[PDB]
């Protein structure tokens, strides 16, 4: 059955192609999550640095 063999192999092309497409989908989606995590880290850094600024206002104020 040459046709049966061709059908089975065609399924392998389908298996590898969708498997590769999914590899890119999973890798691309994870990267987006990491970018969002980096953005959240930037926001947290901004908040803590603002707290440091506010403490500075009172600190340098007392020195003056």
């Amino acid at each position: 059955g040459q046709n049966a063999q061709a059908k089975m192999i065609a399924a392998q092309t389908a298996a590898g192609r969708r498997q590769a497409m999914e590899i890119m989908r999973q890798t691309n989606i994870q990267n987006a999550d990491l970018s969002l995590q980096a953005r959240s880290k930037l926001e947290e850094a901004s908040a803590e640095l603002t707290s440091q600024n506010m403490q500075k206002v009172q600190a340098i104020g007392s020195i003056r």
Partner: protein, 55 residues
């Protein structure tokens, strides 16, 4: 000839730096984002093959 010294008796204005309450700096931007030229090249090869060299 003579110099006015009241500003010395006080905090002379606009001299070096004056601070208010500046907050929310946010530091900087980022050096682009993780680039994928390698993976894009490889997937382009994969599709080209899977279309034309995979009869």
């Amino acid at each position: 000839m003579s110099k006015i010294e009241s500003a010395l008796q006080a905090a002379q204005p606009g001299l070096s730096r004056l601070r208010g309450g500046a907050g929310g700096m946010g530091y900087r931007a980022a050096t682009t984002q993780a680039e994928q030229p390698r993976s894009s090249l490889l997937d382009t090869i994969g599709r080209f093959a899977k279309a034309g060299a995979d009869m």
